[PDB]
Design a protein around this ligand. Structure first.
Ligand SMILES: *[C@@H]1O[C@H](CO)[C@@H](O[C@@H]2O[C@H](CO)[C@@H](O)[C@H](O)[C@H]2NC(C)=O)[C@H](O)[C@H]1NC(C)=O
Ligand SMILES: *[C@@H]1O[C@H](CO)[C@@H](O)[C@H](O)[C@H]1NC(C)=O
Length: 269
């Protein structure tokens, strides 16, 4: 059973900056102590980024075009952003893959899903426990199934600053859904803080599905819906030439966006 919310305020599509975020290890090669020039799908430095903010009567989960791949950040203190649906029609007329953390397991399922237009987890604000999981009402022709080892995640509403910055890069390449991940702690009340955090590949999903759109799977907090403060950010990957500095320990510690300006475009420098 799918549930829509009553009086949702429309999204504002606020604009923010990506600073120097979104850099990821572009492949599996273990380069070390070198500079590496490549042309790949990168998020250019100081690109515009769309901020979807959940607060008060606002609950931003619209269908967002996937295009050539995305950078996706989330500023969190109450584990609101819990997953994504990647697909095309977002109907059960086509294949979709759901990638979620449902508070005990990480689930990745590629099926013909009867998606809820307003998919959400629901948590009791007084009881502090997850009560509902309403993402789809039916599923058939399931093509991919992954369920992680069990864990225990704090689902309850928290107060104060956003303490967790969770970054991801999603690409559809060679029939695979590449999922890159990075994390860093923060303490901020708004916006996507400036910084640099290389993302590492965590999934290379052999789905082979058409992914033109996606939707964020969020968390409503009820005491009959309600919200808790959160925000995610979508940037679009573009074909760009980057120079990645692989340190002596094999770590990407710095990068130059060669299209940023002629000073950067010193071949590059
Ligand atoms: C998160 O999803 C997992 C996977 O569907 C759930 O684990 C399964 O739960 C069902 C009953 O709900 C059991 O029959 C299965 O044996 C479980 N599978 C595994 C691998 O443990 C889990 O219960 C879900 N968590 C929440 C909080 O809904
Ligand atoms: C999903 O497919 C079933 C039949 O397979 C159909 O009854 C249902 O209406 C579809 N979903 C939606 C949202 O229409």
């Amino acid at each position: 059973r799918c549930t829509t919310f009553d009086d949702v305020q429309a999204p504002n599509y606020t604009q923010h900056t990506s600073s120097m975020r979104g850099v990821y290890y572009p492949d599996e090669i273990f380069r070390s102590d070198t500079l590496y020039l490549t042309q790949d799908l990168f998020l250019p430095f100081y690109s515009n980024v769309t901020g979807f903010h959940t607060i008060n009567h606002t609950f931003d989960n619209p269908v967002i075009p996937f295009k050539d791949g995305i950078y996706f950040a989330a500023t969190e203190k109450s584990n609101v952003v819990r997953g994504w649906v990647f697909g095309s029609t977002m109907n059960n007329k086509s294949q979709s893959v759901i990638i979620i953390n449902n508070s005990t397991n990480v689930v990745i399922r590629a099926c013909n899903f009867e998606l809820c237009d307003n998919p959400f987890f629901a948590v009791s604000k007084p009881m502090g426990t997850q009560t509902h999981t309403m993402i789809f009402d039916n599923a058939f022709n399931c093509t991919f199934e992954y369920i992680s080892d069990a864990f225990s995640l704090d689902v309850s509403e928290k107060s104060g600053n956003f303490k967790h910055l969770r970054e991801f890069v999603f690409k559809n390449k060679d029939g695979f859904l590449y999922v890159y991940k990075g994390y860093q702690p923060i303490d901020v009340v708004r916006d996507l803080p400036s910084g640099f955090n290389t993302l590492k590949p965590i999934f290379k999903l052999p789905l082979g599905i058409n992914i033109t759109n996606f939707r964020a799977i969020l968390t409503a907090f009820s005491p009959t819906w309600g919200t808790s403060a959160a925000a995610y950010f979508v940037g679009y990957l573009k074909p760009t030439t980057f120079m990645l500095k692989y340190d002596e320990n094999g770590t990407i510690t710095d990068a130059v966006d060669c299209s940023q300006n002629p000073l950067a475009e010193l071949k590059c420098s």
